Structure 1
Amino acid sequence: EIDLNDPTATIVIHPGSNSIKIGFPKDDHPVVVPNCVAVPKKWLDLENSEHVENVCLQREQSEEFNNIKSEMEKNFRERMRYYKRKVPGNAHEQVVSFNENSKPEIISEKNDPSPIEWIFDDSKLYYGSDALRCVDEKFVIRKPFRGGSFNVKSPYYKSLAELISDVTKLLEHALNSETLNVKPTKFNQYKVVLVIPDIFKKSHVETFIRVLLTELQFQAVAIIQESLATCYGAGISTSTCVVNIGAAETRIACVDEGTVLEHSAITLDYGGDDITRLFALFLLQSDFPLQDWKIDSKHGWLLAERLKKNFTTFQDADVAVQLYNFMNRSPNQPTEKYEFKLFDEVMLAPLALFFPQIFKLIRTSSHKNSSLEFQLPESRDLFTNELNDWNSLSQFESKEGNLYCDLNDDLKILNRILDAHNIIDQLQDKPENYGNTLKENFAPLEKAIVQSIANASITADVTRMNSFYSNILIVGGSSKIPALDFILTDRINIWRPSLLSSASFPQFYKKLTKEIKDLEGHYVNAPDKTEDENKQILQAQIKEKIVEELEEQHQNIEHQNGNEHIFPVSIIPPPRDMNPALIIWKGASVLAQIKLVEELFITNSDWDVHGSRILQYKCIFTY
């Protein structure tokens, strides 16, 4: 019952597309609960909405895709050369696929599971790991969450009601488990710290808080953004830049002195799933023993995910023509073992993180539910009536393909950088249906980080650029690819422009901003011409000059009569044998355990009196 602030009575929850992490803050680990709900096929209208898409794929692809994969193969040839080895390659034996029926002795292939005890009873819904053994000739699988936000676009819900009912039944499931054994009636004994994305939907967060308090009936809820948690999870003191690669999205933000820098936040619309898709496509393309591979099927997906989870690498020293194998488990058959060979497919796949247009090509365009999305309108200011979610400059820029990393000359980069505060201004109160609603962000990871970094400095405290370039956390379940930190460093260094490489840029940019201020400022009398309307351009052309004057000055200043100071690229993975997927929960559970949380719990009464308004007063970030 009673509402003290004590870590015993707290539950930490970090939702996401793949799985919901959940447990008490003192737990060495959280329970990781798959983000699924399996629904009997007969309980749903399945005609008009249609797309019985759980049964179809494509080995042959477009020209544009073959081009890109060709380009990807050359990139691979080159790296390989630049260190190691090449061969006769693709020439094969899987063209003659030989299958070996196993007895019911399936020893473990990886992680925590072994042979599959399936579920045929289609008279109830099933949750989590249980939904995963739900044979999909009787069940459909829907997923309440899309990475910390609510999965609005799914076709298998018809209203927020449905969506929330199984959000609450998924959590209850989670909360009822061997290791944390919590029934709904005892829920009101517990506070929750909830992790939320860096660019959250205010309507979603608010809804979620409203449910945790008012339906599930928890004591009090505190919220934190992913990036900040991932810092408490590790070391929070510095200014750091978090890259977070999960299944659906990859998320990048910089954090400095306790706040997530808004204009650094990027959400790339690709992640581990896309790799899993690309990789299976790639094997199919190298004549893989299973040729009709129903991938958007629950059963085939689970295979594509297992292989890639086993086999993808960025480790050039381990790339060889080699002998792998897998067991294709049986909805209604005998377990069948196959044996296949592999060469480059293990790297081409993850390399698509740098050629993400390929990912767009191999998946269908979003098909969101307007009858659902209607019910969850985007939060607006109760006064002005304007979209009032956090709105990132970097996200806007990257989505639109306006990356400094794609700019050649030092002037245009500097002119845009000198322009930012205007573009962020035009952003916050534009005729702003502008800056695409529907568009997905497919910027390549390396160029994205650079943006995130560049904008986080110039829009806050420029001097921290060094700190940022030498604390890039790579976190998140999909980041467990080996040698990711290696290839990534290689690439930023290829791609980060020289102007944004000079360790003395900030000090320079800090000078240029001053001498530009000394033109609007220490000339507060109408410019030298007696009569003017355009004469702000004679000081706009003097701006343009002082730009080039210092821009040049700094380049002559750059020979330095010798050695050069230049930002590092320190990408830091967690140690081998720690789970990057779980840093975030860990961080949230660190918060849950200190003096701070106390000031940050929105209690029930809090909520009833004020509504979403308290987030203005009780919140670790400026709501």
Structure 2
Amino acid sequence: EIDLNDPTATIVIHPGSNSIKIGFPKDDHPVVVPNCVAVPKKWLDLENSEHVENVCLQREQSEEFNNIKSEMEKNFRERMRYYKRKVPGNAHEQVVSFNENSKPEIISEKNDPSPIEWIFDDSKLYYGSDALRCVDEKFVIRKPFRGGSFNVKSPYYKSLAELISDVTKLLEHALNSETLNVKPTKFNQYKVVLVIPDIFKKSHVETFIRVLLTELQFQAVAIIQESLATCYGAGISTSTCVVNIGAAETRIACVDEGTVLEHSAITLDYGGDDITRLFALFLLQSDFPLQDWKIDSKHGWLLAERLKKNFTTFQDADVAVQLYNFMNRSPNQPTEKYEFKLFDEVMLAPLALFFPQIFKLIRTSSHKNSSLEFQLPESRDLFTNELNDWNSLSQFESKEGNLYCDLNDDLKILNRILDAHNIIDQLQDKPENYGNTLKENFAPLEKAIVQSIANASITADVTRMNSFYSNILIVGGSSKIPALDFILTDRINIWRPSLLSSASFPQFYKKLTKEIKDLEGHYVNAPDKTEDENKQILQAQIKEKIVEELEEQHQNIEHQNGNEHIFPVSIIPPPRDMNPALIIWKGASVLAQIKLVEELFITNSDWDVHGSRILQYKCIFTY
């Protein structure tokens, strides 16, 4: 009952697209619970909204898809030349695919599982790992979460109420488990630390708090943004850039001295899930023995996920015409082992992180519920009525394809950089249906990270550039690809412009801003000419010129009569045998254990008197 700030009585929760991470803070590890609910097909209206799409895929693809895969094949060739080896290649044996029946002795393939003890009773809903064994001829799977937020675009939900009921029943199922055995009538003894994305949607956050306190009846809730949690989960002192690779999205953001820098945040619309889809396709195109792959069905998706997780690498050392195998488990058959050869598909697929346009080519365009979305309006300031979610300069640039890495001269780069504070100003109160609504962000990973880091510095404290480039942490369930650190490092280094590689940029940039400020400032009287409406351009052309002057002065100062100072690119995953999917939960559980959270727990009484308005006063980030 009673409300003390003691960690024993705290549950730390980190929703994600693949699985919700949950446990007590002092746990070595949290329970990992699949983000899945299995619904008997006979319970749902499935005619008009239709797309029984759980049943179809496509080995052949467009030219553009062919072109891009050809170019990926080049990039691969070059990497392999640049270190090691090639061969005769594609010429094959999977054409003549041999399957081998297994006695029911499915010794483990990998991880925590072995054979599948299926669920045939379609007279109830199932949750988590239970949902994962429901036979898909009887059940459909919905997923309450899209990585932190509520999965509004799912078409299996007719309303928030529906969505929330399986959020709460999914949370309950998790909370009731061999290792945490907390039933719903005891929820009011617990407080919750909730992990929330960096660019959270206020209506989701607020709804979730409302749900945890008002319906699940938790004592109190405290929230934290993914990137800060990931810093707590590793080491927070420094300035650092977090790259989080998830199933559906990749999130990048910088963190400096306790805060997640708004204009550094980028949400990229691709992640481990497109790698998985790419991999399946590539396997199909290299004549994979299972040719009709029902990829959006549970059974086939699971198969696609297993293989890619088992097999995809950036490790050039290990890329060889190889024999791989797998067992295809049997909805109503004997278990069939298959053996297949792979060569380059294991790297081409994740290489797509840098040619993400191909991801776009192979998935259907979003089909969000406006019946559901209409019930989660985007947050608006109660006074001005203006969209008031965090809204990041870097998201807007990268989405629109204005990436610094794609600019050639230094002047354009410098000017755009110089323009930033206007671009953010325009952003925060435009005739703003501008900053594309439906548009997905398909910017290549490496260019995105550079964007994030450049803006992360110039919008706040530029002198942290160095520190950012030497603490890029890679984290997230889909980031567990060997040698991702390695190739990412190559690529930032090829792509980062030279202007933005010089370790003295911040110092230069800092000088230029001051000297521009001495043109608006120490000329506070109306410019020299008699008449002035354009006479601000004779100081806007003197600005144009001083830029060129200092820009050039820097370059002559660049020769430096010898050796050149240059930002590193330290990309740092967690050690082999740590799980990158769990840093965040770890970090949250560290918050959960310290003096700080005490001040940050929104309690029920907090919430009934004040509503979402407490977030303005109890929150580790400026809400």
What is the SS of the residue equivalent to 2:414? helix
In the alignment, the residues of structure 2 paired with residue 318 and residue 546 of structure 1 have an alpha-carbon distance, to the nearest angstrom, of 53
Task: Quote the residue 1:23 is aligned against.
Answer: 23
In the alignment, the residues of structure 2 paired with residue 532 and residue 597 of structure 1 have an alpha-carbon distance, to the nearest angstrom, of 57
What is the SS of the residue equivalent to 1:96? coil
What is the SS of the residue equivalent to 2:425? helix
Deviation at 1:313, TM superposition (A): 0.2
In the alignment, the residues of structure 2 paired with residue 590 and residue 524 of structure 1 have an alpha-carbon distance, to the nearest angstrom, of 52
What is the SS of the residue equivalent to 2:221? strand
Deviation at 1:386, TM superposition (A): 0.3
In the alignment, the residues of structure 2 paired with residue 96 and residue 523 of structure 1 have an alpha-carbon distance, to the nearest angstrom, of 81
Residues 38-67 of structure 1 deviation map (CA, whole Å, 9 limit, x = unaligned): 000000000011000000000000000000
In the alignment, the residues of structure 2 paired with residue 243 and residue 546 of structure 1 have an alpha-carbon distance, to the nearest angstrom, of 37
Deviation at 1:430, TM superposition (A): 0.1
In the alignment, the residues of structure 1 paired with residue 11 and residue 478 of structure 2 have an alpha-carbon distance, to the nearest angstrom, of 25
Deviation at 1:116, TM superposition (A): 0.4
Residues 211-251 of structure 1 deviation map (CA, whole Å, 9 limit, x = unaligned): 00000000000000000000000000000000000101000
In the alignment, the residues of structure 1 paired with residue 165 and residue 93 of structure 2 have an alpha-carbon distance, to the nearest angstrom, of 50
In the alignment, the residues of structure 2 paired with residue 495 and residue 363 of structure 1 have an alpha-carbon distance, to the nearest angstrom, of 27
Residues 539-595 of structure 1 deviation map (CA, whole Å, 9 limit, x = unaligned): 000000000000000000000000000000000110000000000000000000000
Residues 63-109 of structure 1 deviation map (CA, whole Å, 9 limit, x = unaligned): 00000000000000000000000110000000000010010000000
Task: Quote the residue 1:309 is aligned against.
Answer: 309
* Structure 1 residues 514-593: aligned runs within 5 Å: 514-593=514-593
What is the SS of the residue equivalent to 1:558? helix
In the alignment, the residues of structure 1 paired with residue 392 and residue 605 of structure 2 have an alpha-carbon distance, to the nearest angstrom, of 33
In the alignment, the residues of structure 1 paired with residue 155 and residue 476 of structure 2 have an alpha-carbon distance, to the nearest angstrom, of 27
Deviation at 1:467, TM superposition (A): 0.1
Deviation at 1:326, TM superposition (A): 0.4
Q: Which runs of 4+ in 1 moved over 2 A?
A: none
In the alignment, the residues of structure 2 paired with residue 276 and residue 531 of structure 1 have an alpha-carbon distance, to the nearest angstrom, of 65
What is the SS of the residue equivalent to 1:500? coil
What is the SS of the residue equivalent to 1:366? coil
What is the SS of the residue equivalent to 1:174? helix
What is the SS of the residue equivalent to 1:199? coil
In the alignment, the residues of structure 2 paired with residue 320 and residue 383 of structure 1 have an alpha-carbon distance, to the nearest angstrom, of 62
Task: Quote the residue 2:71 is aligned against.
Answer: 71
Deviation at 1:20, TM superposition (A): 0.1
Residues 139-175 of structure 1 deviation map (CA, whole Å, 9 limit, x = unaligned): 0100000000000010000010000000000000000
In the alignment, the residues of structure 2 paired with residue 384 and residue 250 of structure 1 have an alpha-carbon distance, to the nearest angstrom, of 32
In the alignment, the residues of structure 1 paired with residue 55 and residue 124 of structure 2 have an alpha-carbon distance, to the nearest angstrom, of 23
In the alignment, the residues of structure 2 paired with residue 205 and residue 478 of structure 1 have an alpha-carbon distance, to the nearest angstrom, of 24
What is the SS of the residue equivalent to 2:241? strand
* Structure 1 residues 71-470: aligned runs within 5 Å: 71-470=71-470
In the alignment, the residues of structure 2 paired with residue 143 and residue 83 of structure 1 have an alpha-carbon distance, to the nearest angstrom, of 43
Deviation at 1:537, TM superposition (A): 0.2
What is the SS of the residue equivalent to 1:553? helix
Deviation at 1:397, TM superposition (A): 0.3
In the alignment, the residues of structure 1 paired with residue 613 and residue 310 of structure 2 have an alpha-carbon distance, to the nearest angstrom, of 47
In the alignment, the residues of structure 2 paired with residue 204 and residue 324 of structure 1 have an alpha-carbon distance, to the nearest angstrom, of 43
Deviation at 1:334, TM superposition (A): 0.4
Q: Which runs of 5+ in 1 are unaligned?
A: none
What is the SS of the residue equivalent to 1:376? coil
Deviation at 1:391, TM superposition (A): 0.4
Residues 258-298 of structure 1 deviation map (CA, whole Å, 9 limit, x = unaligned): 00000000000000000000001001000000000000010
Residues 359-407 of structure 1 deviation map (CA, whole Å, 9 limit, x = unaligned): 0000000000001000000000000000000000000000000000000
What is the SS of the residue equivalent to 2:478? helix
In the alignment, the residues of structure 2 paired with residue 129 and residue 277 of structure 1 have an alpha-carbon distance, to the nearest angstrom, of 22
Deviation at 1:126, TM superposition (A): 0.3
In the alignment, the residues of structure 2 paired with residue 151 and residue 86 of structure 1 have an alpha-carbon distance, to the nearest angstrom, of 44
Deviation at 1:528, TM superposition (A): 0.2
Residues 302-357 of structure 1 deviation map (CA, whole Å, 9 limit, x = unaligned): 10000001000000010000111001100000000111101000000000000000
Task: Quote the residue 2:612 is aligned against.
Answer: 612
In the alignment, the residues of structure 1 paired with residue 607 and residue 87 of structure 2 have an alpha-carbon distance, to the nearest angstrom, of 66
In the alignment, the residues of structure 1 paired with residue 157 and residue 475 of structure 2 have an alpha-carbon distance, to the nearest angstrom, of 31
In the alignment, the residues of structure 1 paired with residue 578 and residue 63 of structure 2 have an alpha-carbon distance, to the nearest angstrom, of 41
Please give the root-mean-square deviation of Cα atoms over the aligned residues, in Å.
0.3
In the alignment, the residues of structure 2 paired with residue 157 and residue 311 of structure 1 have an alpha-carbon distance, to the nearest angstrom, of 34
Residues 398-450 of structure 1 deviation map (CA, whole Å, 9 limit, x = unaligned): 00000000000000000000000000000000000001000000000000000
Deviation at 1:531, TM superposition (A): 1.1
Deviation at 1:184, TM superposition (A): 0.3
In the alignment, the residues of structure 2 paired with residue 455 and residue 210 of structure 1 have an alpha-carbon distance, to the nearest angstrom, of 34
Deviation at 1:530, TM superposition (A): 1.2
In the alignment, the residues of structure 2 paired with residue 342 and residue 156 of structure 1 have an alpha-carbon distance, to the nearest angstrom, of 36
In the alignment, the residues of structure 1 paired with residue 298 and residue 44 of structure 2 have an alpha-carbon distance, to the nearest angstrom, of 17
In the alignment, the residues of structure 2 paired with residue 105 and residue 288 of structure 1 have an alpha-carbon distance, to the nearest angstrom, of 25
In the alignment, the residues of structure 2 paired with residue 60 and residue 513 of structure 1 have an alpha-carbon distance, to the nearest angstrom, of 54
In the alignment, the residues of structure 1 paired with residue 301 and residue 157 of structure 2 have an alpha-carbon distance, to the nearest angstrom, of 21
In the alignment, the residues of structure 2 paired with residue 416 and residue 468 of structure 1 have an alpha-carbon distance, to the nearest angstrom, of 21
In the alignment, the residues of structure 1 paired with residue 256 and residue 539 of structure 2 have an alpha-carbon distance, to the nearest angstrom, of 35
Deviation at 1:618, TM superposition (A): 0.2
Deviation at 1:611, TM superposition (A): 0.2
Deviation at 1:466, TM superposition (A): 0.2
In the alignment, the residues of structure 2 paired with residue 599 and residue 532 of structure 1 have an alpha-carbon distance, to the nearest angstrom, of 55
In the alignment, the residues of structure 2 paired with residue 242 and residue 324 of structure 1 have an alpha-carbon distance, to the nearest angstrom, of 33
In the alignment, the residues of structure 1 paired with residue 592 and residue 336 of structure 2 have an alpha-carbon distance, to the nearest angstrom, of 47
Deviation at 1:532, TM superposition (A): 1.1
In the alignment, the residues of structure 1 paired with residue 19 and residue 511 of structure 2 have an alpha-carbon distance, to the nearest angstrom, of 48
In the alignment, the residues of structure 1 paired with residue 38 and residue 424 of structure 2 have an alpha-carbon distance, to the nearest angstrom, of 43
What is the SS of the residue equivalent to 2:613? helix
In the alignment, the residues of structure 2 paired with residue 126 and residue 161 of structure 1 have an alpha-carbon distance, to the nearest angstrom, of 18
Residues 179-221 of structure 1 deviation map (CA, whole Å, 9 limit, x = unaligned): 0000000000000000000000000000000000000000000
Deviation at 1:2, TM superposition (A): 0.3
In the alignment, the residues of structure 2 paired with residue 111 and residue 582 of structure 1 have an alpha-carbon distance, to the nearest angstrom, of 15
What is the SS of the residue equivalent to 1:11? strand
In the alignment, the residues of structure 2 paired with residue 342 and residue 532 of structure 1 have an alpha-carbon distance, to the nearest angstrom, of 71
Deviation at 1:26, TM superposition (A): 0.2
What is the SS of the residue equivalent to 1:375? coil
In the alignment, the residues of structure 2 paired with residue 532 and residue 213 of structure 1 have an alpha-carbon distance, to the nearest angstrom, of 61
What is the SS of the residue equivalent to 1:384? coil
In the alignment, the residues of structure 2 paired with residue 151 and residue 107 of structure 1 have an alpha-carbon distance, to the nearest angstrom, of 36
In the alignment, the residues of structure 2 paired with residue 55 and residue 391 of structure 1 have an alpha-carbon distance, to the nearest angstrom, of 38
In the alignment, the residues of structure 2 paired with residue 151 and residue 327 of structure 1 have an alpha-carbon distance, to the nearest angstrom, of 31
In the alignment, the residues of structure 1 paired with residue 53 and residue 265 of structure 2 have an alpha-carbon distance, to the nearest angstrom, of 34
What is the SS of the residue equivalent to 1:499? coil
Deviation at 1:110, TM superposition (A): 0.2
Aligned residues: 623
In the alignment, the residues of structure 1 paired with residue 531 and residue 16 of structure 2 have an alpha-carbon distance, to the nearest angstrom, of 62
In the alignment, the residues of structure 2 paired with residue 476 and residue 146 of structure 1 have an alpha-carbon distance, to the nearest angstrom, of 14
Deviation at 1:30, TM superposition (A): 0.1
In the alignment, the residues of structure 2 paired with residue 480 and residue 305 of structure 1 have an alpha-carbon distance, to the nearest angstrom, of 13
Identity, in percent, stands at: 100
Residues 590-614 of structure 1 deviation map (CA, whole Å, 9 limit, x = unaligned): 0000000000000000000000000
In the alignment, the residues of structure 2 paired with residue 338 and residue 533 of structure 1 have an alpha-carbon distance, to the nearest angstrom, of 77
Deviation at 1:454, TM superposition (A): 0.2
